[PDB]
């Protein structure tokens, strides 16, 4: 969500929805969330509650 954006659209390509259950959602903040694909995050400078 860009800073001061009031809309974020999602487009998911056409694929099966076999055995689909609900959705959930919540909002986070960029500075507080590191990626788990990477082993280290040089840009992650926060040590509070994730």
């Amino acid at each position: 969500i860009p800073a001061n954006a009031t809309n974020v659209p999602i487009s998911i390509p056409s694929r099966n929805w076999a055995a689909f259950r609900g959705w959930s959602f919540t909002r986070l903040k960029t500075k507080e969330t590191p990626s788990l694909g990477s082993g280290f995050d040089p840009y992650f400078v926060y040590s509070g509650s994730i």
Binding site: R21, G22, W23, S24
Partner: peptide, 17 residues
């Protein structure tokens, strides 16, 4: 969703082996 659980107890001391 958040919830999803389907692992829970459904429960010479032997028959045949």
């Amino acid at each position: 969703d958040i919830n999803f659980s389907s692992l829970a107890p459904r429960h010479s001391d032997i028959g045949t082996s």
